[PDB]
Amino acid sequence: GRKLLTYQVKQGDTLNSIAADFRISTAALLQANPSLQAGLTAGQSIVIPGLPDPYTIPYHIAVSIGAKTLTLSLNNRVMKTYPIAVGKILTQTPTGEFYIINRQRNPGGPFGAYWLSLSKQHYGIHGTNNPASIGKAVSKGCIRMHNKDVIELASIVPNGTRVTINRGS
């Protein structure tokens, strides 16, 4: 067996939402969790195929809303911290504990040499071509970084790494 990343359902989650959120297939999420098709359960752990275990990962990321920052730690111990951007969509969760689902290396467009996808659709870490929006709070746009920084995380941390969206202070 493989060490994969789990999800704990909230009351009224959707199979196809989580397959949109983790950029997976509901057919694969049903493949990993035959219970989902039948119905959903709040607090039900459902796994994400293709996405490994965050607790095998040596790094941890802390996203501070109140600061607009991204902390790259190693074994909980901070290595670095990169500036990032937060849209009003992240402001919703005061705990925002999430996980990098997978990555998209240089798309080509302004998406900041990379698009590292998060466990929630709008919760996502990517680069930009307008760096002066970095460190800032934006209307909706998801957590933007700088190109060399979004490529850092992309080379340093693997998928499954936990990105903690904290309102902070």
From Swiss-Prot:
Residues 59-166 form the L,D-TPase catalytic domain. Pathway: Cell wall biogenesis; peptidoglycan biosynthesis. Its EC number is 2.-.-.-. GO terms for molecular function: glycosyltransferase activity; peptidoglycan L,D-transpeptidase activity. One of its GO terms (cellular component) is spore wall. Keywords: Cell shape, Cell wall biogenesis/degradation, Glycosyltransferase, Hydrolase, Peptidoglycan synthesis, Sporulation, Transferase. Residues 5-48 form the LysM domain. The active site is at H126 (proton donor/acceptor), C142 (nucleophile). InterPro entries: LD-transpeptidase, LD_TPept_cat_dom, LysM_dom, LysM_dom_sf, Transpep_catalytic_dom. It is found in: Spore wall. GO terms for biological process: cell wall organization; peptidoglycan-protein cross-linking; regulation of cell shape; sporulation resulting in formation of a cellular spore. Regulated by SigK. Could also be negatively regulated by GerE. Transcribed by SigK RNA polymerase. Inactivation of the ykuD gene does not affect vegetative growth, spore resistance to heat, chloroform and lysozyme, or spore germination in the presence of L-alanine. Probable enzyme that may play an important role in cell wall biology. Monomer. LysM domains are thought to be involved in peptidoglycan binding. Belongs to the YkuD family. This is Putative L,D-transpeptidase YkuD. It comes from Bacillus subtilis (strain 168).
